[PDB]
Amino acid sequence: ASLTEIEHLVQSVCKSYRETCQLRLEDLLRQRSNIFSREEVTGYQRKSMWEMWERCAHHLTEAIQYVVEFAKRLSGFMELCQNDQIVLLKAGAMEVVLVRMCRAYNADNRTVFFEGKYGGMELFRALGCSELISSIFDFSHSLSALHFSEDEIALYTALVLINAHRPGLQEKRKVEQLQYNLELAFHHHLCKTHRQSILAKLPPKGKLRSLCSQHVE
Numbered sequence: 589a590s591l592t593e594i595e596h597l598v599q600s601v602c603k604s605y606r607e608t609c610q611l612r613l614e615d616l617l618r619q620r621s622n623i624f625s626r627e628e629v630t631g632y633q634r635k636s637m638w639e640m641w642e643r644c645a646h647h648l649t650e651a652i653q654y655v656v657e658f659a660k661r662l663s664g665f666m667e668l669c670q671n672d673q674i675v676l677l678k679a680g681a682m683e684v685v686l687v688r689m690c691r692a693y694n695a696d697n698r699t700v701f702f703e704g705k706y707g708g709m710e711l712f713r714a715l716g717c718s719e720l721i722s723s724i725f726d727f728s729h730s731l732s733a734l735h736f737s738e739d740e741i742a743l744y745t746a747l748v749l750i751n752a753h754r755p756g757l758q759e760k761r762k763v764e765q766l767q768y769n770l771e772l773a774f775h776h777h778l779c780k781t782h783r784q785s786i787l788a789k790l791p792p793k794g795k796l797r798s799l800c801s802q803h804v805e
């Protein structure tokens with residue numbers, strides 16, 4: 589790995605993320621002023637857990653489609669066997685989507701973009717998943733307060749995906765090589781953007797994995 593190669597990898601990943609990021613930062617930030625009325629909230633509250641679920645499951649599917657596209661656009665992700673690509677997406681897809689949620693979270697009033705507007709966590713009362721939702725607000729909070737940039741997200745999410753210690757992989761070596769190259773890109777870009785600071789301040793593999801497991805449950 590040279591500088592052109594790693595600087596190229598940084599740009600590939602950021603471009604890949606920007607094409608696949610589903611909802612534009614632009615819009616997300618525009619729509620913060622805009623908030624659900626108590627009539628609106630009470631309406632989502634009133635629904636059935638089943639009505640809710642299927643709506644959330646529509647966006648989850650849609651969002652998992654975008655993570656896969658991102659992964660497919662990752663350098664040398666497609667040159668891995670089918671079996672490995674499945675291992676990585678099946679372990680990491682959902683972790684990425686959670687990370688990707690921080691963007692639609694607004695720490696300044698503890699709301700998140702849902703279905704066109706912003707709302708608080710009480711919006712999801714019908715699901716009877718208060719503990720879980722409340723964590724999600726907390727893990728999205730702690731990242732929004734490091735002002736995670738789009739390139740920081742792209743690159744971090746790429747390493748949540750490309751992990752040589754997932755079991756099931758047949759060609760570990762190639763993955764370690766993909767993984768390592770992205771670490772370099774992350775750490776390089778971090779040095780270029782004077783953000784070396786945020787490493788110690790990110791939530792560990794521990795948290796993110798244990799939350800995503802509570803989520804998949």
Ligand SMILES: CN(C(=O)c1c(F)cccc1Cl)c1ccc(-c2cc(C(N)=O)ccc2Cl)cc1OCC(F)(F)F
Pocket residue numbers: 641644645647648651685689700701702703704709712715717720721724725
């Ligand atoms: C509520 N939820 C879940 O993932 C979830 C959960 F956190 C607990 C239980 C059941 C479910 Cl389906 C969920 C699903 C899709 C979305 C979602 C909405 C949109 C959208 N445009 O509204 C787009 C993509 C997605 Cl993945 C957001 C969700 O939760 C937000 C928060 F912050 F409250 F968790």
